[PDB]
Paper text:
Approximately half of the complex displayed relatively lower local resolution, and refinement using a mask that excluded this region generated a reconstruction at 3.4 Å resolution with improved interpretability of high-resolution features. A model corresponding to two Cas2 chains and portions of four Cas6-RT-Cas1 chains was de novo built and refined into the higher resolution masked partial complex reconstruction. The Cas1 and Cas2 domains largely resemble those of the E. coli Cas1–Cas2 complex; however, there are some notable differences. When compared to the E. coli Cas1—Cas2 complex structure, the C-terminal α-helical domains of a given Cas1 are very similar (2.3 Å RMSD), while the linker and N-terminal β-sheet domains are offset by ~5–7 Å. Each Cas2 protomer has a ferredoxin-like fold, as observed in previous Cas2 structures. Additionally, the C-terminal segment (comprising amino acids 88–96) interacts with Cas1b rather than with Cas1b’ as in the E. coli Cas1—Cas2 structure. We found a cluster of residues (R832, R834, R835, and H879) adjacent to the active site that undergoes a large conformational change between Cas1a and Cas1b. In the non-catalytic Cas1b domains, these residues appear to coordinate an unknown density, potentially corresponding to a metal ion or water molecule. In the catalytic Cas1a domains, this density is not observed and the residues of interest are pushed away from each other, seemingly to accommodate the insertion of an α-helix from the RT domain.
Residue numbers in the entry:
A (entry chain E): 641 to 981
B (entry chain D): 650 to 981
C (entry chain C): 1 to 94, 111 to 211, 222 to 247, 258 to 382, 389 to 592, 617 to 634
D (entry chain B): 1 to 96
E (entry chain A): 1 to 90
The structure:
Amino acid sequence: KKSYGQIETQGTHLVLAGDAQIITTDNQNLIVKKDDKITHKISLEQLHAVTLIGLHTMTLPAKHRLLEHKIPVHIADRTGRYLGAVTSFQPAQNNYKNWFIQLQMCDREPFAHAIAQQIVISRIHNQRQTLLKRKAHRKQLQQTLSNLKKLQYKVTAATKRSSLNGLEGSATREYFQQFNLFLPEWAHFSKRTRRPPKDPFNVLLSLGYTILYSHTDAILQSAGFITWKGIYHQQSAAHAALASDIMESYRHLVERYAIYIINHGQIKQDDFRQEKDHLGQDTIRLSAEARRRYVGGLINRFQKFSKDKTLHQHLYQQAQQLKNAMHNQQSSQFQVWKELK
Amino acid sequence: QGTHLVLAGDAQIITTDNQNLIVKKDDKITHKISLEQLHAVTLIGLHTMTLPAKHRLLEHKIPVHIADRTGRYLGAVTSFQPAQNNYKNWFIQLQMCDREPFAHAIAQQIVISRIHNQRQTLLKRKAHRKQLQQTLSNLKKLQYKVTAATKRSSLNGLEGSATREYFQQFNLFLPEWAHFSKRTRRPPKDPFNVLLSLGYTILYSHTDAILQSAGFITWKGIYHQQSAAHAALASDIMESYRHLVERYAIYIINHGQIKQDDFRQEKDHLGQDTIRLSAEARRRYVGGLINRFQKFSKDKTLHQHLYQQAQQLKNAMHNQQSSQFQVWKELK
Amino acid sequence: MILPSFPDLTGLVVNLKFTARAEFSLNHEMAVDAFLRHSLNLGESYSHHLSIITPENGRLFYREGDTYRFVVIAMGNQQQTNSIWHTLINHLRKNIKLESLNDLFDGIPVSSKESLDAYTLQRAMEQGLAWHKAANLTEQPLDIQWYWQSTVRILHADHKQHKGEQRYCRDAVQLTPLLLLKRIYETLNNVATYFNHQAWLKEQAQYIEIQHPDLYWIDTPLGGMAGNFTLSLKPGIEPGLLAMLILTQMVGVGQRRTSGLGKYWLKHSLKHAHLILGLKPNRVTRSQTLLDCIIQPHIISQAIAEIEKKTNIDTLNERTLSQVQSAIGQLRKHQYQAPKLQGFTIERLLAVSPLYDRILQKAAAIVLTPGLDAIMSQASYGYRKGLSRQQVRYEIQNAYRQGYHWVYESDIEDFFDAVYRPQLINRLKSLLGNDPLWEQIESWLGQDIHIKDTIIERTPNLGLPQGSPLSPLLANFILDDFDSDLETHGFKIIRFADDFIILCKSQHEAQQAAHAVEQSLKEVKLSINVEKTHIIQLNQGFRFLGYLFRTNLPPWLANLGTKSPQPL
Amino acid sequence: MKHYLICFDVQHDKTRAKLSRLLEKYGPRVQGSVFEVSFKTPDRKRQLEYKIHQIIKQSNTEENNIRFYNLNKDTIKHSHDINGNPIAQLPAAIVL
Amino acid sequence: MKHYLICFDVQHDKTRAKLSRLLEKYGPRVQGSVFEVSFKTPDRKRQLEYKIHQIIKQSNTEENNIRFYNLNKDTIKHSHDINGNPIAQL
């Protein structure tokens, strides 16, 4: 039960990335038993969310208790791809005010276009910056950077929300094609394979993105939002659109940690387990101990955000800034993160 | 679409064969539905669900709607696509529950259906018809006036008069000890009001859960007052189906499954005198009433029927036409 | 054998007219006693032979045209006191007029007064033994209620220790059944001896019990104790004890019975076979009852003038005046039937009666106010108008020392939902005497509200309706009876200057009562809208009666919990 | 949310037992007769206070030495025992 | 300037008697085994803990069941009794 810092304003964010836990309830407490051995007895007054990566159980009265207290729970599988969530659709104190405001404002075209343009420009700037701190490969990485600049040079001139998806897709493609230069030969890849992750490197990304998504989703739902409706991500596949919309700027913390883990010898190809699942498909996953090490390291790097503020205490700030942008009907109040020049 | 499977019985067990969903009760297979013809699941109470079943459902984008034992709606195991339906139709409901031509058309149809069904209930006795010819003609006369009343208070008065004229006659049916005369009291002093109260509460709770599952906001009503302490839409749509409770109560008292022994006279903590139903009798009655809910029709059970009705009303609001929503009338 | 001899009691009922504006005190035995002493001038022997019953008590301000009735009781054999009394009383014309005189036992008028009827001891034994025969099941509690004539003076165990004014009984705990029977035997033996094994036997044969006492202390500007208690009878009692009870109903018990103090009456359990023994309840009764005083025209005009300020009249007034006059005719006919309440919006929704019945209630309040005010001034549970400021601050600081650290805003409204009516009616029946108005009072207080074809009732024998004129007067009249129910829950009330203040240790039971009331009202609204209920019986929560349409804790706890307290 | 520690001293041998049996659910029995509890909405604190009052009425001696000492974030940060071990500390994210 | 709360449960009565008598002077005995202590400079805290070590060595029990909590200026503000009385106000 390796804890990872001091509790926040809203509570503690339980994670179950282990091996075959069985959550049960007390009507007052949440008890995690592995093979009739009690591992934790957390109180329901301190719990904030819970993530279930693997083959973990949850008894139905526990679902009743977590659905009464409006505590989110997110689910995934051992490969790391996302599955779904157990959320409720009644508001905080039955006040449907903020939800109605959000559902009105998200489909207004100029406002949503301005915020989607901000998010895309932030993402492309962050990608250019992350490709800019590898000195030894600068000669190999000049032209690509210039091309990303050109793509950024067009994002300001995009006048319809339908073009942003294509521009961001091209940027991500030309970005991910360059990781073959840093990574070892056994972890090479050319395409981000999302739904069935079928590469050694892609499992790392698809297992970090769900932790990041669960954090931002729990923060957003505690703010007062309804995460299912998004600004820039119209059509999504099992990800809540708004959480998967905000975490666009913060998803180089998962594409740098993965490079650091692979290069510096913490995770090597002896950890991956390969199987055929449910019909026969080549699926690569992590054993339980490597999953625990990876998730613990990721949460530790989340805590050591830029000093005086952890990532939770930055995402709550940005959620408040977005809410104030939407209530006052001004798109200029919300400012994307835009990692330093 | 497909089958919208509802489990409201007592402790079924759900399992998957990786290409089907199998619901067993005491190891007797009660349901076996292919995953391509399944559209949703509704779990009212405590029903154990094996983990491969839950993963297979979540992978196929099939929401699982979880509700309490009484019938309160809590939430749902979903993903993006099945949870877009829970909010993509909130604004249009608030628009179309206030526009008076639409709302008054639907509130005319509901009362028409209620008076029709409570005529049909007396038609089926066939043993005291001669004493009830006058009452049936009176109910027809009251029903024909609903087609013209262009205000809500007129509808309220007509329905109240019809209900009084319908309950004035049950003393011919019930036995000697169960004869009741005065209108219903909030603390009951007669058995028949107790039985009706349990039935009305059960039907209201289940109607509320099934309405919420379809994507509705149940406090915005079309014919009743938007208020707290109750859901307007649930107590609104449940009027057409109220005859089931009354028919079942008459059946139970007449056929002797409940006698005078089962009622208990007592005083509550508040001190007010009450008569209530004993725990064994209450469990027996609730089980029998849920059985009658399950025996609604050969094709559909009542919960699937209410889901289909909610989908019809959703389409009627969406296309603005106020007569695409045809109400249940118990046509023979 | 208990009394081997006794004098032959005899009586006269005198009814006399008033020709002048006269005002009495609250107890009338002093003035009538002085009247007979300045009239007859018998000296010492008047103490030995005569006694006074005054049925009228608690009516202060009399008027011209109003009568007066009282009873004189004489003892002895071949007395001529009644003869000279007749001869002197016939010419008593002014001030005081004369209407009539009636013999107490036969009931015939005073004429043909050669010999009057003799309440012989054997007749007392008969009227006790036949009562025992017609009332014995040997498995019955045989409760009979005991009402005082506003004063009695007895000694608790004849204590010499306390040595002063404290030597008398002034509360329920000093009432001992053996003490009462011993005092009764003392008075009867004194009267017999003026003209032992036995005192031992009456010590063994005490089976009686004192139940639900309400007795208190009244200090006449003297001293006495007044109230009622349920005397309960166990089956082993013999008729001999009953004979003593019935004879002492007329002779009296206590110190100084010559001034008329120390008499009582007892009203047996209802549905008995009609057996009236000794003194008849319809003879010793106020000559002009309270209801006639209600229907007197000038009081009704006064009430009309009083109520019209917040009348919110909307209809024609000549019909209102015809209605009140017709209702006056009905009340005189003893056939009136009160209207049921109606719920009107003001914002808040308030349930009031039609205005003419409100006028009749205000008239009854105007009549009842002076006697109740005088009895609250002269009693232990008395408001203190002139508060000693140092003493009042000392009481507050002493209560703070007790632990009562929180205070509440004082409003009598919060105590309208907790009043138990039969205790109130019993207290009034003890003070003003038996009267036909009291039934009418209940019919004004226990009505049902109509709101939108819904009948909101109330729990039987509980509560006082808000928005009525009799309620604020009769609520603080019997407020002290809540003290024990405030003591168990850690509440105290301090009275000063026709006001009080509420002191409490903690604020948790108040909030639990408020939360219970709110939940109950939410369930009642749900069962209005769902199960189509039509008769709703509420015990508490009438202040939020508008909410329905737009363990047990006492009902005043909720009304306190709706407020937010303050520290000292 | 608010963190409290409840410390009580009651002499009735059965009433102390009933408070001990009640307060163990909401928080750990950290000391012999000192518990730590946490709440998110003050009505939940009020419910616990009412339960405590209901239990202590059976004493019939009116004991009132039950104290709710608050605990902040920095207050917890500065707290320690003699050994120097930080105490009353809570985790931010358990990676079970 | 720091406020502290001192609490313990040592098993043997005579061993903890010296604990109690040592701790009477530093702060009032607010409850059966609970003390409210005010400090100006941490050296007094260090010497008090040194003496507590002395007596727990005397007891030969190795009791670590001595617990010190802080009491800030606003932590006091929400602190109270069951009857609502504010406590530990200076």
